[PDB]
Design a protein around this ligand. Structure first.
Ligand SMILES: *[C@@H]1O[C@H](CO)[C@@H](O)[C@H](O)[C@H]1NC(C)=O
Ligand SMILES: *[C@@H]1O[C@H](CO)[C@@H](O)[C@H](O)[C@H]1NC(C)=O
Ligand SMILES: *[C@@H]1O[C@H](CO)[C@@H](O)[C@H](O)[C@H]1NC(C)=O
Ligand SMILES: *[C@@H]1O[C@H](CO)[C@@H](O)[C@H](O)[C@H]1NC(C)=O
Lengths: 22, 38, 39
C-alpha cells in the first residue's frame, strides 16, 4: 500500500527488511 | 531505432581498514557499481 | 595468518522457547547488576 546521475545517490541500510522482519 | 542512454559505472567508492598498530591490510569497496570495467 | 574477511551481520544468537500451556519458567536464583549510561 506504499509507493540520479549528477553525483547524488542513495545508500542501502545496514539492516535489511528481512532482518527487521525477523 | 530507439536507443536508451545510461550513465556508465559511477558511484562513491570507499575504503575500510582497522587501526594502524593492528595491521596494514586494507580493503576497497566500489559502491552501487559493478566493477567489471576496473 | 590474520586477514580481512567479510560476512553477513548476525541478528543475535537464535534461542527457541519450550512454550506449553502447563509449564512456566520461574527464576530460583538471582543477582545484582550495575550498568553505566553516559549522557
Ligand atoms: C594499539 O594501541 C592501543 C592503545 O595502546 C592498544 O590498546 C592496542 O592493543 C594496540 N594494538 C595492538 C594490536 O597491540
Ligand atoms: C556483476 O559482475 C559480475 C562479474 O564480475 C557478474 O557475475 C554479476 O552477474 C554482475 N551483476 C550484475 C547485477 O550485473
Ligand atoms: C494444552 O493444549 C493442548 C492442545 O489443545 C491440549 O490437548 C491440552 O489438553 C492442553 N493442556 C495441557 C497440555 O496441560
Ligand atoms: C545463587 O547464586 C549465588 C551466586 O554467588 C550463589 O552464591 C548462591 O549459592 C546461589 N543460590 C542461592 C540460593 O542463593
Amino acid at each position: 500500500k506504499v509507493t540520479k546521475f549528477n553525483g547524488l545517490t542513495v545508500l542501502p541500510p545496514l539492516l535489511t527488511d528481512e532482518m527487521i522482519a525477523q | 531505432e530507439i536507443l536508451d542512454i545510461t550513465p556508465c559505472s559511477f558511484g562513491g567508492v570507499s575504503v575500510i581498514t582497522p587501526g594502524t598498530n593492528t595491521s596494514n591490510q586494507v580493503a576497497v569497496l566500489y559502491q552501487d557499481v559493478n566493477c567489471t570495467e576496473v | 595468518s590474520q586477514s580481512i574477511i567479510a560476512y553477513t551481520m548476525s541478528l543475535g544468537a537464535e534461542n527457541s522457547v519450550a512454550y506449553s500451556n502447563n509449564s512456566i519458567a520461574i527464576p530460583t536464583n538471582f543477582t545484582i547488576s550495575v550498568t553505566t549510561e553516559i549522557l
